[PDB]
């Protein structure tokens, strides 16, 4: 049998790669994004639906010899009602009908967009869930505010920016004492720009006179109070107790302005 | 005397037109004077409808907010009062009023204009 030339091949040494497992690297795929490779190790071929099944938004792709494979995002499944009453959550796992922050086996992964609250993404959500009992005063504020300051500045988010200002107005010149609107309310007086101011306005001056009776007797003085206050050189705010006692959310932008006009002595002028 | 409040600008509009009153002041500063516009309606006591400090901050009455302007030309020694969506409710005579800052007793009224609206 011309006694053949034999030699084995050296003993192997395997790389990181190769003594990947997939089943301990759930806190390394899910902050994957898009457009990356996580590579997970050899995986066997019955195996293969276990991980498309814990992972839906990635696609699984066979990338070497030996079974290596590696993950690739193509989506996020993450809901509103999951992904936009928070600002720390960027993924969860659903198992057995039940939303858990901690991976379990047998779970399936759902994550949120990162650009889910520097978009529109979640405005038809938390228009509604900041509405009623169901206001959360830290989540909603910050919801309106980081509206105004919208990190996608794009042609789209900014106009989603423009479609919530109308809705807003819509539904706080009904009523502009609950707390959403007081919010926002707030922070158009914060951004104080023309537009904003211009919509302070036209939403106070579209309350009830129930409204303007409760919260807006600096903007409107009785009879009484606008003759005397002719009487003095100063403007009427600088003196008036309904206006040192008034939520300046409520004030007209002009009653806001005069309130900065006092020419406060140095230290305490009142 | 010669201290000269005369208001112009009146006339008949029909609900919802616009008027421009006009009152140029002659011995008095607006750096030193409180404006005020008033009206009176006939077979009624006078109100004051706006006004405006020495400093420019201004204030109207609440049921013509929004609807009337009160401003100033310091140049022309003139104070304006813009008069938009004109409601019945807003015939009277309109006239000027001058109040020193620190002096009570420097006070003077003006010759008033008609301002009537109906159809």
């Known amino acids: 049998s011309v006694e053949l030339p034999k030699r084995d091949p050296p003993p192997g040494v395997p790389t990181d790669e190769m003594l990947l497992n997939v089943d301990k690297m759930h806190d390394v795929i899910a902050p994957a994004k898009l457009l990356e490779y996580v590579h997970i190790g050899p995986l066997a071929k019955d195996k293969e639906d276990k991980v498309k099944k814990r992972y839906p938004e990635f696609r699984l792709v066979n990338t070497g010899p030996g079974g290596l494979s590696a993950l690739l995002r193509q989506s996020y499944a993450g809901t509103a009602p999951n992904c936009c009453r928070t600002f720390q959550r960027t993924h969860y796992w659903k198992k057995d009908g039940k939303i858990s922050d901690k991976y379990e086996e047998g779970a399936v992964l759902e994550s949120c967009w990162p650009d889910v609250h520097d978009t529109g993404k979640c405005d038809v959500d938390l228009f509604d869930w900041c509405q009623g009992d169901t206001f959360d005063r830290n989540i909603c504020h910050q919801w309106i505010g980081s509206a105004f300051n919208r990190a996608d500045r794009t042609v789209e988010g900014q106009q989603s920016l423009i479609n919530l200002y109308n809705k807003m107005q819509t539904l706080c010149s009904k009523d502009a004492s609950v707390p959403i609107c007081e919010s926002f309310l707030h922070h158009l007086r914060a951004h104080n720009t023309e537009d904003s101011k211009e919509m302070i306005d036209y939403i106070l001056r579209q309350q009830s006179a129930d409204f303007k009776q409760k919260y807006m007797r600096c903007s409107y003085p009785t009879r009484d109070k606008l003759e005397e206050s002719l009487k003095y050189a100063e403007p009427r705010e600088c003196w008036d107790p309904e206006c040192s006692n008034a939520n300046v959310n409520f004030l007209l932008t002009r009653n806001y302005n005069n309130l900065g006009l006092c020419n406060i002595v140095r230290g305490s002028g009142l | 005397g010669e201290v000269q409040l005369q208001a112009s600008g009146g006339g008949l509009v029909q609900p919802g037109g616009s008027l421009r009153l006009s009152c140029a002041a002659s011995?008095?500063?607006?750096?030193?004077?409180?404006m005020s516009w008033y009206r009176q309606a006939p077979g009624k006591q006078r109100e004051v409808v706006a006004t405006?400090?020495?400093?420019?901050?201004?204030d109207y009455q609440d049921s013509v907010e929004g609807r009337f302007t009160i401003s100033r030309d310091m140049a022309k020694n003139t104070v304006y009062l813009q008069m938009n969506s004109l409601k019945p409710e807003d015939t009277a005579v309109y006239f000027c009023?001058?109040?020193?800052?620190?002096?009570?007793?420097?006070?003077?009224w003006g010759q008033g204009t008609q301002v009537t609206v109906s159809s």
């Open positions: 009023n001058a109040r020193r800052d620190n002096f009570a007793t420097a006070i003077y």
């Open positions: 405006i400090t020495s400093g420019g901050a201004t």
């Open positions: 011995g008095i500063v607006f750096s030193n004077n409180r």
